[model samples]
Target: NPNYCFAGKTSSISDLKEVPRKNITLIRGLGHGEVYEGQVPLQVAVKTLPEVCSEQDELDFLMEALIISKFNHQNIVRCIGVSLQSLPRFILLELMAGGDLKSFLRETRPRPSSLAMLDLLHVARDIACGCQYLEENHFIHRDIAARNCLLTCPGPGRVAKIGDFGMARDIYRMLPVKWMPPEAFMEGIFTSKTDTWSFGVLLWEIFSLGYMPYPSKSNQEVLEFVTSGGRMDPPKNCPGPVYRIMTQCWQHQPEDRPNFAIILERIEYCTQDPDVINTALPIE
Candidate 1:
């Protein structure tokens, strides 16, 4: 068995702090002694299947939890621990106060105190760094949308981290159609390159203030769009240079797309030019 047996006590139903949304909840618990000491308020993300659980299903769930435990990066959600031996299973993770990026963007877009383009760009850099770490460790986050990324708190120097590894796998398997690259969608091939492709869409979400990709297009439509060489246009507020970076990620061939490291460097380059971040978006 490649999985570790968690010895921590199971959290009671009352321990749950928030309403269950998407079978995930934010709960309070003590750290696993590896990351923190004493009691702490942790975000417990629950993941469970229907009552019909074969023995194999339970084993696979435990295996997935093991892989999540291996993650240790500033930009990746720290898995405090998990409860796999009992029912109502859940994965304990560091609570992200700022919540997911999609909602964060929506809340900030209408306020003047919102993050500037440059600040958001730095957040983008943070995500690139996180994805780079995953790729280096031979993990593929099949779902890398902005919805899966979360912020630490509401403040300057925005600290963003990648979370929600429900579809993540150590090997090449599972691909979310909307976020997948051409090869992965058609041939069922997933790689770091496909992740890069999703990052591009995530960037689009940031600039567009959380607009859904392919707004009216269905999954099949998106597949056909990609098959016909259609790509997303630059967000209205996105700068030309930054838009160019997104285009690089949407390249027809996965090999042609920029790696996360290169993407990080390009973002760093953008940071050097004040104009790249200074440009203001058109008034709504």
Candidate 2:
């Protein structure tokens, strides 16, 4: 008898249901796998597993879904339930209509006001909020980039969330060289603070309306650049306080980088400050 796994751990997940394979409709392709858009009544983005995977491979898939099942935060994409009663195991996530943050920012780059004031601040705040939860709970998301973050809706009201737990090393990259910190390469160290460093690069992506970090620099050079203590300048018109926070995240020592809790506090202070957000340039 071929022993089927998911033995005891299946109970670790609540609301685990069998999704009718026919109920899900396959959608467009994505880098990691096919993102099938469908609904078991409620709209969802379905993640699928390969047909010829090992039992351990199957277990790995369930575990990532396990990470998602445990989280209940709004900033981290919500996992409604898993449809693994049979083969073609599907992990259903809440539908994010606005697509990935990278594309969203690029789409609205021309309409700069779309991200002004609380709008832009909110997305950064949301990502920080999500990361903080993950960090405090001890999940190190090795890949923290704009592309990995998804928006719940469109327009300014759209909420940003952490998704694609592709490298949730809470258990362990293509090596996100540009977004990585010095210690990541020097000592091969990966801590929650490593994510803090990546969040800094994510800020640059957000504030620059989705421009690539270290634009015009090669991967090897980017490594050398950070090794040499070279940090990029803030996007034109980016608030001074936000830029300062970005630099803080890039500090040589991991401890020097502000944790997500402090980052959230300073973020709100800057965005809500009467001097920063509400401050109008003296009617010149």
Candidate 3:
């Protein structure tokens, strides 16, 4: 019987150098949890999914991710390469030492003042920018959320990147309900417009600093809530302008939701000109 590897298996960087290892670079622990190998000073994220994923399936996904990396926009993350070696196959890419946005928010929640307020706005902008780029390229990042978004720089205003291409597909394909459109939930189509709808949810995640967009709800319950006039409000202590952006993003109707380009413009306007950190909005 094969050893039971963790659901999320990561390898040390040195493991890649073994003889007959082919072109794959082995690294340790995904994200920045630990660095045990790779002497080239390259911070590569190495993750291994089980063989159940099928070699062809992994290859197809990896090829797609590599293709998305070709996007030169600052908001999108880059994929270095993928290896399908037996057992612990590896995926090497630029490391984001900042971990993910959700972890960042949780770690800093105890001391809000210490966290960079601007980071939230920046991430939203990055995601929106990435979505704008993807839509233009005829691709839809079916899963656009805090978990899929990565941070690559130190705080205040770090570089936010969109990643996780395993679920992404051409606008013509259908996406799963976990992170998809209402229409796609019922029907079987995910259009560019639906991507915009999900972007609104992304905006909520960012504004909330990576908290669950809906605090008290089950998986399907959350979707139902959002569909039935439910929207996440800015945290009691969030910047007033930022809250307004969140509300606008969660508009129930797809047409009501702002497109990525418009969303980016609004974020820039809020963060730069209006100075959301100090601004206040009228309660409705």
Candidate 4:
């Protein structure tokens, strides 16, 4: 029998180094779990299994750490190791100084032109590139939101790395509905393209300066609005090409939506040269 191994399976579980809880101090809460900032000798964002139980939940906790460990891409958050021996298991991630994308977007209050074209489009490209990696690796992000992405810098030229795996599954809930596409909410189907749908909503959040989608509607109401073919208006000063990309991801059928590769390709082209007309306006 394998010691501390699940069902005689030992992969990441056997290899991951365990850190004592005494070695970490809780810094603040981010999204679902209380993240800590400390040294396992170096700075890391120590994330815990958010309020979990049952046999499956334990695996999900370890699974997130295991999966992230395999990724070599710059856009995907790196997992340093796990602290499974402790009471509250930890997934030690590279600490991101810039925080999550949602908060950054929410705080960016300025005219559109004050922000460079690259600022508007590059995050999209980085996330698309991340998603492209996941798609190729056969990983489905299920929940890709502004909240799940982190920036290395607080401003433009910042590198975004996707993190916070709550929507990875058990992190499921009602509020995430607004990011879902018709096929997803209506049919309970999920795929990489389903993630593509969520990415569209994420893009909307980015250009709108992180405005909450359907701020006025209930989760149920947003469903009806989307099912009825209603989509939010383009955010003020939102470039038309970007809006077109959102519309592309909104297709009713997964088959109709462009894959991450195509989405990344389009964003790359837009960043270099494409139809770009952004009209900036200010609100008092």
TM-score pick, better of 1 and 4: 4
Task: Give the runs in model 4 whose Cα sits over 4 Å from its true position.
Answer: 1-12, 19-32, 49-57, 111-114, 169-175, 274-284
**How many collisions between residues are there in candidate 4?**
0
TM-score of each: 0.79, 0.86, 0.75, 0.84
Q: Write the per-residue lDDT of candidate 2 for residues 1-284, one digit (tens) a residue.
A: 11111212333444345567677766665445457777676888888888688876676677677667767788989887777876678888888888899998887664424446567788999999999988877777888999899998887678999987866622331578988999997888889999999999998888888889998999999999999999999876677888898999899899999999999998988887755665322110
10 residues in a row with least lDDT, candidate 4: 1-10
User: What would the per-residue lDDT of candidate 3 be over residues 82-198, giving only the tens digit for each residue?
Assistant: 554455554555677766776766665434234545666767777788888877766666677777777886566578787566575332123345455666676656666677767
User: Candidate 2: where are CA atoms >4 Å away?
Assistant: 1-17, 22-32, 52-57, 111-113, 169-173, 278-284
Among all candidates shown, the one with the greatest TM-score? 2
- Candidate 1 lDDT, 85-150, residue by residue in tens: 444555456667777898888777745335678767878999999999988876778898998888
How well does model 1 score by local distance difference test? 0.72
Model 4: lDDT to the true structure: 0.77
Candidate 3 stretches with Cα past 4 Å from truth are: 1-27, 31-40, 49-56, 59-61, 64-66, 84-87, 110-113, 169-179, 273-275, 279-284
Better of 2 and 4 by lDDT: 2
Q: Mind giving the per-residue lDDT tens digits that candidate 4 earns over 1-284?
A: 11222223445466666667687665666545467775676678888765567677776777666556666789988887778877677889988878888988766656442454567688888889898988886667888889889998785668998976656635421548989988878888888899999999998888888889877998999999999998888877777788889999988878999999899888877776644623443442
Between candidates 3 and 4, name the one with more favorable lDDT.
Answer: 4
TM-score of 2: 0.86
